[PDB]
Write a protein that binds this ligand. Structure first.
Ligand SMILES: Nc1nc2c(ncn2[C@@H]2O[C@H](COP(=O)(O)OP(=O)(O)OP(O)(O)=S)[C@@H](O)[C@H]2O)c(=O)[nH]1
Ligand SMILES: [Mg+2]
Length: 278
C-alpha cells in the first residue's frame, strides 16, 4: 500500500561553521519535532564510534502519492578539528562507501536504504580557501555537492553580493593545484528552484547564504500559541533566521525537504550504478 522512499544528506565543512545548528533547523519542519542544538562541538571520536548518534531523522506521509518519506541528515565533525584535514576527508569518504556496501549486502541477501544522496558543503563567510575547494572536489567524486555559505550575518549586503559571485566563480574555476576536473555540483531544475522561492540572481548557480540560530525570540515564544522564531540578538540589532531578507534558510529547507525530493531520488540508481565498478 505505502511506498517508502529514503533520502540521506551528509553535511561537511570546517569546524565551528554552524553545521549542527543548520541541521537542527532543516529537520525542524513545522508540524514536526522542533529540534535544537546546544552549541557544543561535534567530536571526531563520536563520529567514529557512534555515527548514528549524530544522525537526525524526520519522516512524513504523502497522502495523494501514498509515499512515506524517511529523511536522514548525517552530521560530521568539522575538518579543522584535527591537525590533518585529509584525515577527515577520508573518514567521510569511508562513511559514504560503507553505506554502499551495506546496500549491496542487503541487496545480495534479498529495504531501509542507508545510501548518501547529497552533500551539503558549508562554506565559511568572506573567504573560500583552496583547502575548501580541494575538499569539495574530492568529496564530489562520491556524492553531488550543494554549496551553502553559513553565518551570513557576518556580511553586509554589499559584501554578501560580492562573495556570492566569488564563490560561484571559484567553484567553476578553482585555480587550485591538482584540481583538473569540474567540481561535482548538484544542478537543480529551474522549476524546482522557483517553487522553493530561490531568487534568480545574475550569477548562475550561486551558493545559498543562510543564517541559523539555536536561540529563539522570547517575545514570540510567549505568544498563545507559541511561535518559534530563531534569532541572533546583538547589542545593535537582531538578525532573524526565517527572514527572507536576512537568510536563504527557508528557501534551502523548502528546496531540500520538499521541492527537490523527486530529482534527488531519481539520480539514486545511476549514482550507485557508477559506484559498482569497484
Ligand atoms: N554569527 C552566526 N553564528 C552562528 C550561526 N549559526 C550557528 N552559529 C554559532 O556558531 C557556533 C557553533 O555552531 P555549531 O552548529 O555547533 O557549529 P559546527 O560546525 O557544528 O561546529 P563543529 O565543532 O561540530 S564542526 C555556535 O555558537 C552558534 O551559535 C549563524 O548563522 N551566524
Ligand atoms: Mg557540529
Amino acid at each position: 500500500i505505502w511506498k517508502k522512499k529514503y533520502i540521506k544528506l551528509i553535511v561537511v565543512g570546517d569546524s565551528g561553521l554552524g553545521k549542527t545548528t543548520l541541521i537542527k533547523s532543516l529537520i525542524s519542519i513545522p508540524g514536526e519535532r522542533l529540534q535544537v542544538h546546544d552549541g557544543s562541538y561535534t567530536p571526531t571520536e563520536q563520529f567514529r564510534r557512534d555515527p548514528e548518534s549524530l544522525s537526525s531523522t524526520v519522516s512524513w506521509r504523502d497522502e495523494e502519492d501514498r509515499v512515506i518519506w524517511v529523511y536522514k541528515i548525517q552530521d560530521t565533525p568539522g575538518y579543522g578539528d584535527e591537525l590533518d584535514v585529509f584525515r577527515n576527508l577520508k573518514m567521510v569518504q569511508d562513511y559514504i562507501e560503507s553505506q554502499n556496501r551495506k546496500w549491496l549486502e542487503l541487496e545480495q541477501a534479498r529495504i531501509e536504504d542507508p545510501r548518501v544522496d547529497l552533500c551539503i558543503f558549508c562554506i565559511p563567510p568572506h573567504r573560500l580557501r583552496p583547502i575548501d575547494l580541494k575538499y569539495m572536489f574530492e568529496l564530489g567524486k562520491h556524492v553531488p555537492v550543494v554549496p551553502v555559505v553559513t553565518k551570513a550575518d557576518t556580511m553586509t549586503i554589499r559584501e554578501a553580493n560580492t562573495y556570492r559571485t566569488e564563490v560561484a566563480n571559484r567553484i567553476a574555476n578553482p585555480m587550485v593545484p591538482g584540481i583538473h576536473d569540474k567540481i561535482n555540483i548538484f544542478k537543480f531544475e529551474r522549476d524546482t528552484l522557483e517553487r522553493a522561492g530561490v531568487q534568480d540572481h545574475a550569477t548562475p548557480h550561486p551558493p545559498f547564504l543562510v543564517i541559523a540560530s539555536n536561540d529563539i525570540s522570547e517575545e514570540l515564544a510567549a505568544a498563545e500559541p507559541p511561535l518559534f522564531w530563531p534569532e541572533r540578538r546583538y547589542p545593535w540589532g537582531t538578525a532573524e533566521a526565517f527572514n527572507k531578507e536576512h537568510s536563504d534558510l527557508l528557501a534551502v529547507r523548502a528546496l531540500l525537504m520538499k521541492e527537490a525530493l523527486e530529482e534527488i531520488s531519481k539520480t539514486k540508481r545511476a549514482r550507485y550504478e557508477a559506484w559498482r565498478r569497484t
